Design a protein around this ligand. Structure first.
Ligand SMILES: *[C@@H]1O[C@H](CO)[C@@H](O)[C@H](O)[C@H]1NC(C)=O
Lengths: 50, 39
């Protein structure tokens, strides 16, 4: 989508594997604010907004 | 033939969807218990 009309997808009721994203070499920026990438794969959240 | 669904008119903001296997003189007796505890 365009940045003015950015797409928001709500992610619920599944298992989110963050190590697949973190260990990928295809991403230039993976800057996390407020949480560290190492403990993302352990913690649990109510909803994820993408 | 089932060809009439009139239960709703709209669906705006969904939080949870779950599709499962079917649960189902009077011949069948179906007992259900529904509880709302801690969400
Ligand atoms: C719920 O739906 C209405 C209209 O469909 C929308 O304006 C509102 O932002 C929605 N709220 C959420 C939390 O999705």
């Amino acid at each position: 989508a365009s940045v003015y009309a950015w797409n928001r997808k709500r992610i619920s009721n599944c298992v989110a594997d963050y190590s697949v994203l973190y260990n990928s070499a295809s991403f230039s920026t993976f800057k996390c604010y407020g949480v560290s990438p190492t403990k993302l794969n352990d913690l649990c959240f109510t909803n994820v907004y993408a | 033939m089932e060809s009439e669904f009139r239960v709703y008119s709209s669906a705006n903001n969904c939080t949870f969807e779950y599709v499962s296997q079917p649960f189902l003189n009077f011949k069948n007796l179906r007992e259900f218990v529904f509880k709302n505890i801690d969400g």
